[PDB]
């Protein structure tokens with residue numbers, strides 16, 4: 170009934186995900202695993218659908234075997250009336266696609282020791298906050314988000330599920346200096362998908378014919394992923410997710426934040442961004 174978050178080692182989490190960390194202690198990573206890591210609302214499902222297509226040889230028929238949350242186990246995931254990411258993992262064939270949003274501080278050390286390849290996607294903070302706000306509304310395990318203005322404040326101080334966005338994109342950016350990480354930008358996936366898909370291939374190590382590349386580019390577009398029940402979380406139960414309130418597959422654009430951000434909010438957020446982001450070579454596009 171909109172349980173409030175629970176804090177674990179500085180990080181605020183969904184009551185249940187906090188509990189899901191118990192059995193996560195048991196998790197043994199294989200070396201052929203690949204970790205998809207992102208701050209919520211930055212392209213998890215998109216890069217997931219890309220990566221599984223790669224893993225099925227460009228075969229849309231196989232990418233339909235189950236919905237995306239069953240093909241790519243959500244490591245820390247746990248909710249009522251759905252199986253825990255870890256329960257789902259016990260039936261996932263290798264080589265396995267795995268999904269988290271946990272900060273390094275909560276990440277299972279087995280993934281780091283096993284040098285598991287990581288595909289990380291970042292997205293400009295403004296679009297993330299907007300996206301995250303509507304998601305909080307329709308994804309009923311989160312706390313009451315309140316007014317946009319109040320939610321935006323919380324977001325600036327990382328008083329939201331998975332903590333601070335600013336900490337998250339920065340720490341994983343530094344991690345890639347010691348660990349195998351392809352660091353991708355949502356807005357780059359918008360500008361030229363084909364380009365970002367060939368980078369994933371290089372990284373994962375697969376060659377595929379253009380026929381099959383161009384193919385994937387089309388079957389991973391917002392529009393196709395929106396109508397595909399295996400990728401749009403519409404098969405989930407209503408009490409866990411409610412698409413009338415807001416669809417998971419909401420808009421899929423860069424620069425949309427502008428229709429929610431007040432000009433006073435923008436001015437303030439900008440000044441706060443510069444202050445937090447200033448010792449960091451990362452750099453985002455918002456349009």
Ligand SMILES: Nc1ncnc2c1ncn2[C@@H]1O[C@H](COP(=O)(O)O)[C@@H](OP(=O)(O)O)[C@H]1O
Pocket residue numbers: 207208209210211212213214215296300301389390391392394417418419420421422
């Ligand atoms: N194929 C695609 N291309 C572009 N954006 C996509 C996409 N599939 C999903 N999205 C968008 O990516 C966000 C989902 O993030 P995550 O998977 O990390 O939860 C949502 O953003 P919006 O709410 O801004 O539309 C969703 O609509």
